[PDB]
Amino acid sequence: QRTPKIQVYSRHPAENGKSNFLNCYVSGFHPSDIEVDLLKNGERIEKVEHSDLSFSKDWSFYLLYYTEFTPTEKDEYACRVNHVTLSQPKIVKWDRDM
Amino acid sequence: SGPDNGAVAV
């Protein structure tokens, strides 16, 4: 299967207590329909924005989901992707070092 | 300016 690849990362280098943007870059998937959620401590963040549908030279689709956020020591951020090629939700945790 | 694929479809 042509499953969605995921990168979860911040727009700027993370510093606890400083406002930033959390990104989930989902790519390499086909067909185009997909459900992407950003999670905070396992709960869906509302009003997450996303880019318009685009595709790469290998035909696969890609999207950027993002929200404003403030990194902290203990809040756990993640990206959850649901797609027809997956047998289950794909969850990738945000790691400020990656 | 994009292509016009014309009258003949796949």
Binding site: - | G2, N5, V8, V10
Partner: protein, 276 residues
């Protein structure tokens, strides 16, 4: 980096039921989106996506919008035909995609022309580099290949690619000059991540750069190292990010150098781990 280019990436997705397909067309100049058409919009029309496109008057937008309405119908008929070729159910979900465009040479003439299609995300039929012959990828595409060899489709697309494609690209490069000539150089730094077994990961970051073209390398005492490299990713502000990491021995971090190559830089950046 490289020749100037224009591409149109077009997609139609059929929807289950009596619902007509969704058609999206995206235009790019030098790998940056500059126009978009989406049939799901309240008022479907081509829209400027790069603000320098607002140098075009209302006649341009009307003509391109009419062209998109024609392409949308061509994709609708083509999706219906493909159902027949592969003996699929009439009210299902299927995707037809096209890529078309040109690269310009030093004589402002066509360097390479591109014209290919995919069905369900897989190659279907493509125009070869000669702009004269077709590569059918599977057995259903043989039906299309015969039909298009008979209709002279290659000549039709060769004329667009060598003419209109190249001429409109030259016009867009002139109008978008002030923006297209802007580069954002990468800001680079090295981070240190201790591991078990006396090893350390050194990660070389390149942040906030435009265009996306970049090279990151790691060297041990000036000798190249063949390293984990993530795919270039958007920062969300129009610029890009990338990093490259290596696992090194503890105590020998200063023997490693990262080098960043990008067109915005007067020279490549060389850097190393800077302990506090």
């Amino acid at each position: 980096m490289g020749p100037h280019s224009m591409r149109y990436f077009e997609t139609a997705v059929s929807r289950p039921g009596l619902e007509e397909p969704r058609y999206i067309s995206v235009g790019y100049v030098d790998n940056k989106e500059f126009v978009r058409f989406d049939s799901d919009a309240e008022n479907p029309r081509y829209e400027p996506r790069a603000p320098w496109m607002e140098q075009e008057g209302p006649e341009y937008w009307e003509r391109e919008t009419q062209k998109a309405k024609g392409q949308e119908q061509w994709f609708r008929v083509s999706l219906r035909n493909l159902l027949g070729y592969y003996n699929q159910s009439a009210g299902g979900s299927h995707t037809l995609q096209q890529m078309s465009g040109c690269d310009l040479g030093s004589d402002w003439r066509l360097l390479r022309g591109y014209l290919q299609f995919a069905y369900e995300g897989r190659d279907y039929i493509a125009l070869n580099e000669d702009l004269k012959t077709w590569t059918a990828a599977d057995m259903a595409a043989q039906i299309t290949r015969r039909k298009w060899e008979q209709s002279g489709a290659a000549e039709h697309y060769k004329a667009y690619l060598e003419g209109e494609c190249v001429e409109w690209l030259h016009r867009y490069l002139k109008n978008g000059n002030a923006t297209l000539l802007r580069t954002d150089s990468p800001k680079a730094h090295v981070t240190h991540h201790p591991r078990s077994k006396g090893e350390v990961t050194l990660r070389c970051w390149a942040l906030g750069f435009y265009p996306a073209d970049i090279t990151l390398t790691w060297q041990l005492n000036g000798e190249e190292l063949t390293m984990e490299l993530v795919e270039t990713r958007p920062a969300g502000d129009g610029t890009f990010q990338k990093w490259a990491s290596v696992v090194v021995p503890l105590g020998k971090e200063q023997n490693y150098t990262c080098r960043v190559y990008h067109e915005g830089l007067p020279e490549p950046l060389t850097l190393r781990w800077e302990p506090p």
